[PDB]
Amino acid sequence: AKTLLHQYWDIPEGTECHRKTYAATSIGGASGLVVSAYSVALKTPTSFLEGVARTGRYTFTAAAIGAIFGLTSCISAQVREKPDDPLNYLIGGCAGGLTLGARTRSYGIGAAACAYMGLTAALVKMGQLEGWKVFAEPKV
Amino acid sequence: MMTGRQARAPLQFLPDEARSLPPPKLTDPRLAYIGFLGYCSGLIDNAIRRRPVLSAGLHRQFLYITSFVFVGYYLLKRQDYMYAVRDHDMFSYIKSHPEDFPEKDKKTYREVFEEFHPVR
Amino acid sequence: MNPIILIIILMTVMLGTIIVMISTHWLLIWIGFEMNMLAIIPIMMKKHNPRATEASTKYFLTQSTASMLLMMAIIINLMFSGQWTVMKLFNPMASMLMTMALAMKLGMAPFHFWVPEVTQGIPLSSGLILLTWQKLAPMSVLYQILPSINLDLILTLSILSITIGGWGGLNQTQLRKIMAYSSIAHMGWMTAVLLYNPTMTLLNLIIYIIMTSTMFTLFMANSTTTTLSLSHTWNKAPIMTILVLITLLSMGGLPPLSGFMPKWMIIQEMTKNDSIILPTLMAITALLNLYFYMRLTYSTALTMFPSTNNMKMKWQFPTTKRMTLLPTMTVLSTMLLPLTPILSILE
Amino acid sequence: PFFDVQKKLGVDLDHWMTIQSAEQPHRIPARCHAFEKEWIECAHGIGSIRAEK
Amino acid sequence: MLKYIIPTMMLMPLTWLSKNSMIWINTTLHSLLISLTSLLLLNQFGDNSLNFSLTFFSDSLSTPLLILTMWLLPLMLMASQHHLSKENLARKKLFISMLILLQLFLIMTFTATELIFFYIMFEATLVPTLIIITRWGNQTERLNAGLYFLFYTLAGSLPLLVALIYIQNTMGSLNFLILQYWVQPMPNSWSNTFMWLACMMAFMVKMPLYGLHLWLPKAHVEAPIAGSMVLAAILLKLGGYGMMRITLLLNPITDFMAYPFIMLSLWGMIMTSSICLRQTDLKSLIAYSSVSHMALVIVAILIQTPWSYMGATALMIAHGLTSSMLFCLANSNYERVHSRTMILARGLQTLLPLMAAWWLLASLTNLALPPSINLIGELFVVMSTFSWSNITIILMGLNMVITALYSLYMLITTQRGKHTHHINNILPSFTRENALMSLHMLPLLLLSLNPKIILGPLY
Amino acid sequence: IARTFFDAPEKNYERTMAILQIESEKAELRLKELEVRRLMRAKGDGPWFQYPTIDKALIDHSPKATPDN
Amino acid sequence: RDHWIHVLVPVGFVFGYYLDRKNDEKLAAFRNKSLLYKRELKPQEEVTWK
Amino acid sequence: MSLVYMNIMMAFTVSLTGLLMYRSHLMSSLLCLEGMMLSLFILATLMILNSHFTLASMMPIILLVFAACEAALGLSLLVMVSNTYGTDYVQNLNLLQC
Amino acid sequence: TLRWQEDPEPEDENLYEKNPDSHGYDKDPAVDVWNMRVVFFFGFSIVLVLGSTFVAYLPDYRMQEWARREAERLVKYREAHGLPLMESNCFDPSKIQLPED
Amino acid sequence: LLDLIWLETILPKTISLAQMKMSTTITSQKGLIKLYFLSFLITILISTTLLNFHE
């Protein structure tokens, strides 16, 4: 999962929409596959068909969220000519939240996901710009 | 952190270097607070067993206070020793490495420049 | 159970823990672990009901899997280093296997699934012995091998443990399951601060041991295992309601109680190493532990739930249980914050 | 915690097994006695951080 | 500051060793003696603060708050002794003990030189108030009120602890006397933006800010009378003291990071006053009035000018006294009629004339009748906000009109009109209630003669 | 009032100076301790962060059964 | 005494004042050394303040 | 390194995946656990004998003794649950979900 | 059916019934009158009156009167010698090194 | 509309419902050892391959 994040962040922002979208979709699909694996492990399905349907549904939802977020953020960076700006990532996060609402087919969870994941994507953008460390190496 | 210090002479509560330090006074405020902790535990011991709290078993409350004072005195001795060791190691390492700890060129305020942000 | 056989078995448990603590050989660490587990199995099965045998079976399977993983890590380290001295490891695979073996033995998430069921199936005294004494040896082994521990793995285990423990304890009504999820969250905190300053880990371990011992001792003093039976305590002994109120407030880390000191010093240590997001996330997550603690205090001390008729028959008799060290750990778990600089004795 | 009971008490409970270059019965040498002896004579007394480099 | 701490902790053996009938007399007497003793803090100098020790100091901002706390404790002892009449003796002593402990934490909070000691005392104040509300409150939802209050405060305050520890590690000290001379500019970045948010949100929640005020019309309502008095009079001012102390480190990033909260608090006071216009509950109406006045204090602190600071501290003291008196009057009505509905008991001036006079005086000071210190604080904040921008005079004038409207609506509804026919248990006013009202009123009127002792450290 | 209850301005002045000197010394010592801890962690040549190694007093030096060792 | 409970608190205030004076004496490192109040000692005294 | 080491690691991994996925019986889990111990025995014995570490030759005996005592305890637990339920199925050990 | 066993709500006690001279402090008349005397003496006669007297005679609170006297002295001294009463710069420009640009 | 409906909706009620839903998902395990050990195997595989904790 380390090489997926580097290959997503190696592309300059607002430059290559297709490759950024593909990298975001791959990251989303990996996360959805992990979620589906734990789901079919702990909550066992009725049959093989129900389990593979749940796996496909979760993976497709997460991959669609990733693709929509990447495409929206890259397009907003292209249009505004502001590559280093967390507003583009906020727009992409709200687009991903609206996609999550569309997949689950309910408006309220979609709006809440728009707000919360737009804030989260903006925070990730600020951390990338300012060099915030989440798993900080021991120093003192 | 300090296991290299406490590695050549292991499992010692107070090494022989601790005796060069001033012992805590018996009127130490921390020691008095630990004695108050002992008194409070004695009162709780009276309370949970449905005894008169301030009257029953004065020997029990005295032993509570005495035990707390004893253990707290030795813990305070160890704490003071370990902070002394911390400072000693810090100063020895600062003195032994003068290249890494240069003297800061202090400047008066007539030479330094600070931006002014008006509040209006 | 014979008193003498019980004495011998308890000293065998402490002997296994001592053998793990004092030895410089990996095989002796393994030997102490199996001695401790083999001796502690009959403490779980003191009552001989199907729930105790089920809990003992799950505990045995989990500890045996963790022990085999530990032996695998030791053998890999011997293969790649040719020695057995308990110190930093010479292989990342051996370090990963040993870290996950110690995580399985501690019951940290996602290996946490055995802790609440095992704690529920066994008596209160054996559950106290488990959740207090069984965690001294894996944390000592972790304290000995910190130069080889992967930072990402241990931090992931820590944050997962804290979140899963809080979310799990939100839903429980049995007291033993609440104590188990609380334990999971606290081990998350302890192994979170492990790689930066292990003295903070020792301080958090000591404070958690004292607070858990106080809460379990109050539970066996009142013979309560559910929320409602604990809520009946106001009509039997209100001093115990005051004690459980102050101890549960201190367990949530509310200042100026002694439970504030571990997370305060942990946040102090984590910000020195330029890690700011994780201590904020762990504090916000520990608010959930505070939530179900406060729910318990609402049901027990700050309201008067309806009682029954036979409480009068219980009024006419005094208690005779040996509430050993209960006032001492009640005082030491609430009014220890002014003695915070005492943590320098643990370095 | 690693309570060094053996060094405090002077007993030798598991140090004889702890390395391959130690005192072996009938003076039987190991295959890598010399290399291990040289590595130990390096790493002694300088800590793990200095001995790793 | 040990000459006030030690008698406060000696109040505890006084209430735990008194007779079954002499606990109120002893506690009230000795708390009044310590309140008289608290006047020795007025040895303030024009250049230097009164620095007692390494841990304690008291400048001209913390001194009025200290005197207010130490004077407020015997008022709560006098107020809370009628509804605790039939209570068990041990529970009565526990109630008095929680009041004593809260006063101890409050007087250790305002004098803390170190910022982390201020934080520790400021969050130690949570436990006695939560216990008082959730134990001696009368309603069902006192538990929900306690949960809301506790979790709003802790969710606001944990990032403050993280940011204070960061400031300690970066600057080297949290001593307020050191930080006055060692302060550095805070540049514009995202890191400093979240520093400002972390340092400010705890006191924005505790004040409260509009939008974070949802815990106030619950904790102020389901509490007992002493709890409501100590929540309205002192506990809202911990946020004001915190923003006055912590704004020193947050420059010059405050000048643009203060815009959204200035718009929240300028529009928020209009919303809360309009809410006050249509309230069926008297206690909730007083709580929302408190929200509006603390929004005024928030704006005054955020624009950070000398006139705004003087108006903010004067308004804090004045609103504490006025809100305490209003809560006491509402409690007396509640003891008479056993309901908090404002429309139930009407026309009480024909039955309770001197209580109606006390109601009129409290209402007059609520709408800032000059030359009360209410009007002095409100006027100074209005002048400073006019200096900030000119349309603030439009907002302030609208707020003043609605404030007069709801205060006189309170008075006209409760006291005037035709009395309720079927209510016949309206007893004459006791000497205790009248003494409580006069002890709230007379310091408030006397402070208009010498208003210079409540105008902050930059008078 | 100023003779009985209040304190002299000189006393408060010099007391504040003493407090400021003590607290500035404490802050400088805290910063120096942070820098020392960082340097000792990075280099490993100081008395702190001395992780243990194999003790060389355990090595057998007597002649073995095989010369090539 | 039959009214010792009425003298618990004033002796607490007196003891707190005494501890305040003791600590003020403890913080006397810059007595008669400040650049604003430095002066020669008048005879028949040894310190500027106590 | 050598090849028989790779085969013993793969045998240990196979027995571990067998233990970590129960089918029906507790006895199959115990058999997978004891196969894991046997693979540990073979690996450690081969390493010690090839390295000519003379004093380490006592380790596999102690390992065998301790893990066989473990297996005796596990067999006793299996017999107890079989006496409780009439079979050693792992789906009957689900009372502690509540 | 009939619900759980619980006492009904007790009737409110009128303090003026058994004691028409009540101040509302306590049910015992002696404790009540002594509480009234304590509150009225130590609240109004002691704290309010002597507190107002103490605040009224504060020894030059925050040096305002001294500042006025010193301003009078400085204005007289500067007016006598033709000096400007106040300068635009608080510190001397001679002892200030501006950054070179 | 604002403080009785919406200001109550955004901050406290949505957060409370989210924590309630997460708690109900976490604690809904079926109490089977086989599923727990399958989850352990999945965790080991994810850490070894997808997360590279053995490097």
Ligand SMILES: CCCCCCCCCCCCCCCCCC(=O)OC[C@H](COP(=O)([O-])OCC[N+](C)(C)C)OC(=O)CCCCCCCCCCCCCCCCC
């Ligand atoms: C009552 C409800 C509302 C509560 C609101 C509370 C405040 C909101 C913002 C809090 C942010 C978290 C604390 C930040 C402390 C920053 C200290 C600092 O040094 O900052 C600079 C540091 C900078 O890192 P550094 O200082 O290590 O690096 C050195 C400096 N540079 C970058 C130049 C190299 O900032 C950070 O490390 C990250 C700050 C942002 C953190 C974002 C995650 C939290 C998001 C908000 C959560 C709010 C509560 C949510 C839960 C509510 C209840 C359910």
Ligand SMILES: CCCCCCCCCCCCCCCCCC(=O)OC[C@H](COP(=O)([O-])OCC[N+](C)(C)C)OC(=O)CCCCCCCCCCCCCCCCC
């Ligand atoms: C202080 C912060 C905490 C706040 C809460 C405190 C609670 C505890 C209370 C403790 C005691 C009270 C403390 C504050 C006391 C304030 C009062 C005080 O001391 O003032 C000093 C002030 C001091 O005034 P001064 O400063 O001008 O005096 C000069 C100073 N000396 C005396 C040294 C020369 O006292 C007065 O102003 C008294 C003046 C004389 C009396 C009044 C005469 C006129 C009265 C009205 C006449 C009619 C007018 C028209 C009416 C029409 C109808 C309405």
Ligand SMILES: CCCCCCCCCCCCCCCCCC(=O)OC[C@H](COP(=O)(O)OCCN)OC(=O)CCCCCCCCCCCCCCCCC
């Ligand atoms: C760096 C740190 C290194 C290590 C430092 C030292 C760590 C000490 C850890 C202590 C762990 C305690 C474990 C639990 C208690 C052990 C004793 C025991 O077996 O107690 C249970 C026993 C069962 O008897 P039974 O009659 O069946 O009880 C059922 C109720 N009728 O008896 C009972 O139930 C009797 C009822 C009372 C039991 C009270 C037990 C209190 C034990 C904890 C004391 C406080 C913690 C130790 C001191 C501080 C250490 C930091």
